[PDB]
Design a protein around this ligand. Structure first.
Ligand code: RFF
Ligand code: RFF
Ligand code: CL
Lengths: 299, 305
């Protein structure tokens, strides 16, 4: 029993974290095989190819624990800088670079000076920002999932927006959202609630004995989406309904039956009650996270 | 900016997790140097649990009855002894991944990271607190016994908890790494129940200071309170008494934000009376008690917004 916001074990990622210094700027890098990946803003209206062309390999100081790594090459790929080093990381895990979609969750290993300080779980918001916890020096910190024994890197931290939310790129340097890596006026768009995730969390509550919100009613998908659009909830698609199939079979509650519970919660509130110790509807657990935590899958 | 429930990186602990099997029971063990630590109930059957006589069950076991597995490698058990509710298995190989470590016994209100494991394999990491009734609100399924709780301030791992059981309310009970239980619990399937749980007052106050540091002040008021009047009100909402030690401990956060501890207590009294009125504090509609004053100082910036 119990339901916690759970992150993946971070050990395979800790063995990849390094410190990258260029002039007065210091941030984090991801050392995989003989390449260190880091935000290209470490070299800083920027003209990144012009700033990069005047740098030599010896201008980039890379530190792995107490050892200095020797930079033998450098190149850019979108908003990520790739530093070729002389030594392959002996701790390189089996890995892939994957681009995630809004609604998908991942673990963040927050780092300062190439040293990991914490691990937390979060979700890519529909507005492409993440509600992270980052201070100055956290740029280059990464987001990941573990599938079997392979680390799938999906996020690299680059910046904080004026509302305190965060923006970054996949490991190929492409930003999530309409953001750019420069000091200019940027703002997160209006956000929405991840509907398929709230439904998954309602199923997790039912699995844990919290059933007060269940009702005899059902709804059509179209009527649910008309209601959901009024409360700034993302539209629920037939793919989401299919994805919630296993949880629906385990608890005996049809997805559209759970949608009618969600509709009543939106129009009437919780009436002084909580669900899994929360007075708000939680949207940072995917259907897969609910199944994984309520089954004990190991890495 | 931002405020998350954050766990310590779990790598130093992952390299210590092993699987321990004794007959039909399989649980997790912590391999440090040449010793594997695990709950002594690994020697029990489900029947034995009503009234186990561990000394009698243990004397009947030999070293080769305990099967220890570290990854794909079988470790050879060369000795065994019981220390309180923990079994210590002497093995013939020292763990090369043994970090710098200490065994520490924590007090209620303290937080720690839990690396939940099944079959000696880590599945997840989460943050939690030792409740005032000595239980933890964990996320543990069958096979998670032997999973550990820890803090990693600097480069040394301080092990503070080993998981042993789930009580009927779904909450969890366990021991320090010397095998002493937290709370009046026994590793016996006898009628046991968690005492009435209370809110960790010093932690809610720390979290209200974290909201001020991150730029939120809507909940503050022009009032102050005496410590005694605060406790008289707090106890009516099932909040733990706030002691002078707690007031002293909140000193640094009080100096950083410029809000006296008893002024923050007045704001807490008012939140308990009024609720939040549709507002949130650090993205939460409930008052959060699983962040200590030390966690707030570690996670937050030294410059108030
Ligand atoms: C400085 N700082 N504080 C916290 C924090 C967390 N993550 C990243 C940070 N850094 C950035 O985001 C940097 C610096 N900044 S800034 O304006 O100082 C950031 C700010 C805002 N809004 C918090 C005050 C400009 C900028 C522009 C582009 C890119 Cl790619 C990076 C950056 C963090
Ligand atoms: C079986 N199980 N499911 C989840 C879980 C989490 N942690 C520990 C577990 N195991 C125990 O707690 C065991 C077995 N049980 S039990 O009755 O099956 C526990 C239960 C309840 N209530 C969850 C179903 C008795 C008991 C008594 C004392 C000690 Cl030391 C160990 C144990 C977990
Ligand atoms: Cl303590």
């Amino acid at each position: 029993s119990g339901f916690r916001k759970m992150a993946f074990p971070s050990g395979k990622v800790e063995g990849c974290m390094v410190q990258v210094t260029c002039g007065t700027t210091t941030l984090n890098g991801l050392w995989l095989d003989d390449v260190v990946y880091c935000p290209r803003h470490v070299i800083c209206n920027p003209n990144y190819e012009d700033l990069l062309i005047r740098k030599s390999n010896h201008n980039f100081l890379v530190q792995a624990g107490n050892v200095q790594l020797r930079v033998i090459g450098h190149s850019m790929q979108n908003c990520v800088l790739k530093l070729k080093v002389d030594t392959a990381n002996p701790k390189t895990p089996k890995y892939k670079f994957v681009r995630i979609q809004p609604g998908q969750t991942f673990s963040v290993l927050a780092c300062y000076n190439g040293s990991p300080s914490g691990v937390y779980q979060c979700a890519m918001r529909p507005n492409f920002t993440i509600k992270g916890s980052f201070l100055n020096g956290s740029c280059g910190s990464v987001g990941f999932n573990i599938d079997y024994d392979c680390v799938s890197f999906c996020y690299m931290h680059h910046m904080e927006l004026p509302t305190g939310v965060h923006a970054g790129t996949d490991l190929e340097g492409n930003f999530y959202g309409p953001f750019v890596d420069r000091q200019t006026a940027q703002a997160a768009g209006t956000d929405t609630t991840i509907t398929v995730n709230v439904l998954a969390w309602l199923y997790a509550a039912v699995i844990n004995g919290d059933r007060w919100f269940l009702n005899r009613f059902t709804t059509t998908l179209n009527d649910f989406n008309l209601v959901a659009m009024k409360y700034n909830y993302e539209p629920l698609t037939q793919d989401h309904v299919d994805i919630l199939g296993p949880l629906s079979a385990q608890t005996g509650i049809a997805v559209l039956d759970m949608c009618a519970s969600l509709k009543e919660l939106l129009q009437n509130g919780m009436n002084g009650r909580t669900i899994l110790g929360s007075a708000l509807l939680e949207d940072e657990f995917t259907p897969f996270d609910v199944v994984r935590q309520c089954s004990g899958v190991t890495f």
